[PDB]
Design an enzyme around this catalytic site. Structure first.
Site, short mmCIF file in Angstrom:
data_model
loop_
_atom_site.label_atom_id
_atom_site.label_comp_id
_atom_site.label_asym_id
_atom_site.label_seq_id
_atom_site.Cartn_x
_atom_site.Cartn_y
_atom_site.Cartn_z
N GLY A 29 0.82 -1.20 0.00
CA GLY A 29 0.00 0.00 0.00
C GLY A 29 0.86 1.25 0.00
N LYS A 49 2.69 -4.83 9.19
CA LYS A 49 2.96 -3.74 8.26
C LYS A 49 4.25 -3.02 8.68
CE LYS A 49 0.08 -0.08 8.53
NZ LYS A 49 -1.11 0.75 8.17
N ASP A 145 -11.58 9.39 2.81
CA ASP A 145 -10.86 8.60 1.80
C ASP A 145 -11.07 7.09 1.95
OD1 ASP A 145 -9.40 8.45 -0.55
OD2 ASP A 145 -7.44 8.57 0.45
C1 LIG Z 1 -4.50 -13.37 3.33
O1 LIG Z 1 -4.63 -12.09 3.93
C2 LIG Z 1 -4.96 -11.15 2.97
C3 LIG Z 1 -4.83 -11.37 1.61
C4 LIG Z 1 -5.18 -10.38 0.72
C5 LIG Z 1 -5.04 -10.58 -0.75
S1 LIG Z 1 -6.61 -11.10 -1.41
C6 LIG Z 1 -6.28 -11.22 -3.14
O2 LIG Z 1 -6.86 -12.44 -0.90
O3 LIG Z 1 -7.59 -10.05 -1.20
C7 LIG Z 1 -5.66 -9.18 1.20
C8 LIG Z 1 -5.79 -8.96 2.56
C9 LIG Z 1 -5.44 -9.95 3.46
N1 LIG Z 1 -5.56 -9.77 4.85
C10 LIG Z 1 -5.17 -8.60 5.54
N2 LIG Z 1 -4.62 -7.59 4.87
C11 LIG Z 1 -4.23 -6.46 5.50
N3 LIG Z 1 -3.65 -5.33 4.92
C12 LIG Z 1 -3.12 -5.20 3.63
C13 LIG Z 1 -3.07 -6.25 2.73
C14 LIG Z 1 -2.54 -6.07 1.47
C15 LIG Z 1 -2.05 -4.84 1.09
C16 LIG Z 1 -2.09 -3.79 1.98
F1 LIG Z 1 -1.61 -2.60 1.60
C17 LIG Z 1 -2.62 -3.97 3.24
C18 LIG Z 1 -2.67 -2.85 4.19
N4 LIG Z 1 -2.85 -1.62 3.61
O4 LIG Z 1 -2.56 -3.04 5.39
C19 LIG Z 1 -4.44 -6.42 6.86
C20 LIG Z 1 -4.19 -5.46 7.88
C21 LIG Z 1 -4.63 -6.00 9.07
N5 LIG Z 1 -5.13 -7.25 8.80
C22 LIG Z 1 -5.02 -7.51 7.46
N6 LIG Z 1 -5.40 -8.63 6.86
#
Ligand SMILES: COc1cc(CS(C)(=O)=O)ccc1Nc1nc(Nc2cccc(F)c2C(N)=O)c2cc[nH]c2n1
Length: 347
Positions: A29, A49, A145
């Protein structure tokens, strides 16, 4: 030192507490890479993160600081909590990176948007977004946002908002502005229901599986808005600054489309009488959120009470005690110390 170990995640070095094992990138991100990991102590999976030199500029610093503070003073099921925070550096002088540890969710809303959802799941996801947003509002936080990439879900349909919302940085990273309200696009004043526009954009996209207003810039963005919804009324025009007013009034005039044409029955479950009624209600809610003039747009509370949403209504979730938060302008070194103190739980 020996309480930490280092692994390479793409071009990032993650230096983490030994309790966190089997790190895997789950995405990236505005602040860099986020990893999944196994917490050997809690015996469950977490998200980690990395904030790399968050004090490097004012935009990064104010976001990191605000996130640390707000995550700590909010305790709501639809807002991400802080499980742990640490720095592998040993002093303020040496201080570089902050690691934020949160419970691991299964996917983000971007993924959910690529799926067909029945009315039960769709309405429940929306209810939760509304609960999270209202809780923030109750603390005097207006997001501005909200976007799918910053919203996460579990397989059980539970949902959490990851960020706390609203410039120049020397990065190739481009911020997604597609979900921002006309008030934000046009530089107007705003109130709480600025966030309802964003929910509307997300709901619309959940229904049609396409971004509603995908503008390359704010000018293109506004064009896409008026193309679909129609040029706003003279009443709205008067609310605008003279420089903005002349611009908005001089744009080509558009009639817009009815919400029946924007969101036809084919995009909804609509076989049974039950589903037909729900489709009608869903469209009604959309027609109340995707409203250019904020003075005519639905409030959060009205949206929570709406027939499409209110089947889920629970006062413990929708009327929770407001968070107690305990304008800043600072230099790099000042932000560095503020963030370090917050990480180390210092005064
Ligand atoms: C397997 O876990 C995932 C897998 C995916 C990919 S999909 C294709 O299955 O949707 C997306 C989210 C997650 N889970 C997730 N993604 C997060 N946060 C994030 C996940 C991905 C990218 C980011 F920038 C963040 C962030 N901004 O914190 C966070 C922040 C706290 N808990 C989270 N859990």
């Amino acid at each position: 030192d020996n309480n930490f170990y280092s692994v390479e995640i793409g071009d990032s070095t993650f230096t983490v507490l030994k309790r966190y094992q089997n790190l895997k990138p789950i995405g990236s991100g505005a602040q860099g890479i986020v990893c999944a990991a196994y917490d050997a102590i809690l015996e469950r999976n977490v998200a980690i993160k990395k904030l790399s030199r968050p004090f490097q500029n004012q935009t990064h610093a104010k976001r990191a600081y605000r996130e640390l503070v707000l995550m700590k003073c909010v305790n709501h099921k639809n807002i991400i909590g802080l499980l742990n925070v640490f720095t592998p550096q040993k002093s303020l002088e040496e201080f570089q990176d902050v690691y934020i540890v949160m419970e691991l969710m299964d996917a983000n809303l971007c993924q959910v948007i690529q799926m067909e959802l029945d009315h039960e799941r769709m309405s429940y996801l929306l209810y939760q977004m509304l609960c999270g947003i209202k809780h923030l509002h109750s603390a005097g936080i207006i997001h501005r946002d909200l976007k799918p990439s910053n919203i996460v879900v579990k397989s059980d349909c539970t949902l959490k908002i990851l960020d706390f919302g609203l410039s120049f940085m020397m990065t190739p990273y481009v911020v997604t502005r597609y979900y921002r309200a006309p008030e934000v696009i046009l530089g107007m004043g705003y109130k709480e229901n600025v966030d309802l526009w964003s929910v509307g954009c997300i709901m619309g996209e959940m229904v049609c599986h396409k971004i509603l207003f995908p503008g390359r810039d704010y000018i293109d963005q506004w064009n896409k808005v008026i193309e679909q919804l129609g040029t706003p009324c003279p009443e709205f025009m008067k609310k605008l600054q003279p420089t903005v007013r002349t611009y908005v009034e001089n744009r080509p005039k558009y009639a817009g489309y009815s919400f029946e044409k924007l969101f036809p029955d084919v995009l909804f479950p609509a076989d049974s009488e039950h589903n037909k009624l729900k489709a009608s209600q869903a469209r009604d809610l959309l027609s109340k959120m995707l409203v250019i003039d904020a003075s005519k747009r639905i409030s959060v509370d009205e949206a929570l009470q709406h027939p499409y949403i209110n089947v889920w209504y629970d006062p413990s979730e929708a009327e929770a005690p407001p968070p107690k938060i305990p304008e800043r302008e600072h230099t790099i070194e000042e932000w560095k110390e503020l963030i370090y103190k917050e990480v180390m739980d210092l005064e």
